[PDB]
């Protein structure tokens, strides 16, 4: 009788029978393999640009298509379409709201999107010949706060809020397609595969769920962290992905081997990790912390290959282009800088 | 050099001057933030503050000066990841009710909610103001059940002057930092002028202290 306690014990039973089956398989560590690797050297790199146009905080950035155009957001309700060669600004977009959490740019080059605390993901057009800046659509299906949203094409978008869920909308119809329920903590960020078939979601319950796009069900759920998770980026092949947390430990998960591989511990300052980024071909994981720094970890050595200069406030967003020639750092003192 | 860059820098400068002349208009005006509790008193105090989903602003005016009230309670999520986005504000309103002591630990929940905002690492400069609503409704509460229901550590009389002062005394002794900010307290009323005017004066004092933060006279 009273089999609900037995159903609760089935969770720990299936955990110990399935998730704790990594003792005779997860044997290869990254010290026997990474002994005969070569380092990358002390990276001496300096700021080439300093985009002094904003007047508020910047924690939202996404690149263009041909590695040319930047999208930036301020806390005055202002989007700026920056250029990365001549320090040019092209489109200044006033917003209905004022507090912007994230922004995104289209993989083709036409549309932008931004959202914040008003639970409205506003998608705007840039290629309109009639009133160059105008409102295309305003999606609204969340009751918390929009945290991170990225495009798939010019007809769909993947948004995520603090309602312990994430959704896939539709620009052509205006409604939603599916809703990925089954999450416990607050969803913070997401990244997606370059072939756009699998996306990894963030959490505040120290998990990194790999979801599915087409079928609408969860695929994998990870663990390993002891705090919240602020930023997740995806490896340019499809094997691994990095996760940044609030305990100064940036971990590198895995999907094929299904085992945590490498930890990044900064023994000097134990502040959080609020931005991660990969390079073009690996071996340079960029990480923007909360201690006014931007460090360069190695993907196999896990030692810092040089540091970057900071700002008057914390570096809150990173970015590496499609080719791998521009690092962009965005802090809260309106100094969106472009390094080497 | 500068084939069409002489026309490109013109567009680069026009909507950069526009950013400055639109940011000054939003930076010269004063902003007032509004915390509270769960549907405690944030509907009565906004009856005068009306006019000239997520969060919605309230843009009213008084003595030819526009205020912007920023509500909080519409967000059904945690506070640890977006309370830093609401900094730079001048005055934080933390509206507290009085007749919710009997229902359940509601006043005991508001004390640790007031504790988390007075010791926040981002709000170490903005002074906080707390209201105490239901002034006439609390006067009849004492004769049935006193304030000493769940307080074995304090003794007192059953008068209205002792009950209203101890709630003001218990809230004020919660902040660990006392040098920078100063907690303000005003009992509400059923009138229209005196309900907000002190708040008016309160914002005045903050900017005077802010000027003493600017000249170094503090």
């Amino acid at each position, epitope marked *: 009788q009273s089999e609900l306690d037995q159903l609760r014990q089935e969770a720990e039973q299936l955990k110990n029978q399935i998730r704790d089956a990594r003792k005779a398989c997860a044997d290869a560590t990254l010290s026997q393999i990474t002994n005969n690797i070569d380092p990358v050297g002390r990276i001496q790199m300096r700021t080439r640009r300093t985009l002094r146009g904003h007047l508020a905080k910047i924690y939202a950035m996404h690149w263009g298509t041909d590695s040319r155009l930047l999208v930036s957001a301020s806390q005055d309700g202002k989007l700026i379409i920056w*250029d990365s060669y001549t320090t040019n600004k*092209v489109h200044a977009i006033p917003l209905r709201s004022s507090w912007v959490m994230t922004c995104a740019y289209a993989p083709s080059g036409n549309y932008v999107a931004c959202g914040g605390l008003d639970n409205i993901c506003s998608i705007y057009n840039l290629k309109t010949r009639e009133g*160059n800046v105008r409102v295309s659509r305003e999606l609204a299906g969340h009751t918390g706060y929009l945290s991170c949203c990225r495009f798939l094409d010019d007809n769909q978008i993947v948004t995520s809020s603090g309602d312990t869920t994430c959704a896939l909308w539709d620009i052509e119809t205006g409604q939603q397609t599916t809703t990925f329920t089954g999450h416990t903590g607050d969803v913070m960020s997401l990244s997606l595969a370059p072939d756009t078939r699998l996306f990894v979601s963030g959490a505040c319950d120290a998990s990194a769920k790999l979801w599915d796009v087409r079928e609408g069900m969860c695929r994998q759920t990870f663990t390993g962290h002891e705090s919240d998770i602020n930023a997740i980026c995806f490896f340019p092949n499809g094997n691994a992905f990095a996760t940044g947390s609030d305990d100064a430990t940036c971990r590198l998960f895995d999907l094929r081997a299904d085992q945590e591989l490498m930890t990044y511990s900064h023994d000097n300052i134990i502040c959080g990790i609020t931005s991660v980024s990969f390079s073009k071909s690996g071996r340079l994981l960029l990480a923007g912390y909360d201690d006014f720094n931007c460090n360069v970890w190695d993907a196999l050595k896990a030692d810092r290959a040089g540091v970057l200069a900071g700002h008057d406030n914390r570096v809150s967003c990173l970015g590496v282009t499609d080719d791998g020639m521009a690092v962009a750092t965005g802090s809260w003192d309106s100094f969106l800088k472009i390094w080497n | 050099l500068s*084939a069409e860059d002489k*026309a490109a820098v*013109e*567009r680069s400068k026009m909507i950069d001057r526009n950013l400055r002349e639109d940011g000054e208009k939003a930076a010269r005006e004063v902003k007032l933030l509004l915390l509270g509790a769960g549907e405690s008193g944030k509907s009565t105090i906004v009856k005068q503050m009306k006019i000239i989903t997520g969060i919605v602003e309230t843009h009213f005016t008084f003595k030819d000066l526009h205020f912007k009230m920023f509500d909080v309670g519409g967000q059904r999520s945690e506070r640890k990841k977006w309370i830093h986005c609401f900094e730079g504000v001048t005055a934080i309103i933390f509206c507290v009710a009085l007749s919710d002591y009997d229902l359940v630990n509601r006043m005991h929940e508001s004390m640790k909610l007031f504790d988390s905002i007075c010791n926040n690492k981002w709000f170490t400069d903005t002074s906080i103001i707390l209201f105490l609503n239901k002034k006439d409704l609390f006067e009849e509460k004492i004769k049935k059940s006193p304030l000493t229901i769940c307080y074995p550590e304090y003794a007192g009389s059953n008068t209205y002057e002792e009950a209203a002062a101890y709630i003001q005394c218990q809230f004020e002794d919660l902040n660990k930092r006392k040098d920078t900010k100063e907690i303000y307290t005003h009992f509400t009323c059923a009138t229209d002028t005196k309900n907000v005017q002190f708040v008016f004066d309160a914002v005045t004092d903050v900017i005077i202290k802010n000027n003493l933060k600017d000249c170094g006279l503090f």
Partner: single-chain antibody
Amino acid sequence: DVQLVESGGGLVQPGGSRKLSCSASGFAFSSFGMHWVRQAPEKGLEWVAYISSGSGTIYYADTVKGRFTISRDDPKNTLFLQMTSLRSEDTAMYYCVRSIYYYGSSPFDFWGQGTTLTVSSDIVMTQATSSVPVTPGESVSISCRSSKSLLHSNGNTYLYWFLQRPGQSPQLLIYRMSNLASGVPDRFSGSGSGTAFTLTISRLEAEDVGVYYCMQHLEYPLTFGAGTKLELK
């Protein structure tokens, strides 16, 4: 969907002074600079003046300066052109033009009706010869060769291909030598290098015949050629 409103008048003796107006509707008029394009009845296009968006840049040509004045009214959404000391060789068809200049833009993308006014060392461009027999299915190679090298190491090459349909206003085909304008089919595959240029028009259909212009926009003023039209025979 947008509309451009103009007016008209009578013939003016040489020695007059008038004012022309161009009104706009359907888009924001403040964020577009304004050109004046003057078309002689001998098919040759030429440029008069340009005003910028922030009213801080006014450009004229060599034989244009002094007697002409341009102004604009943004709450009224109008463009005024005051012409003084008119002659018998500077009265022609006119066109008021919107144009915006940024990265990924289309200058000279939509023109207007304009006005009619009658009486009674630049960069050398080559346009020859305006008689090419085409059929619905025959390709064409329009010759437009420049003298100054347009390779700025920028690397935008500023040549503009325009089509003039018979009876109405001309429209843009190709901007910055390799792009495609909005509302233009993909038959106008143009390319080139430095000095040489080639406009390949394959799988032709007898619905877009007209006069093909090539315009050179590296330095001011706007240099032109003579014109290149096709024929059915």
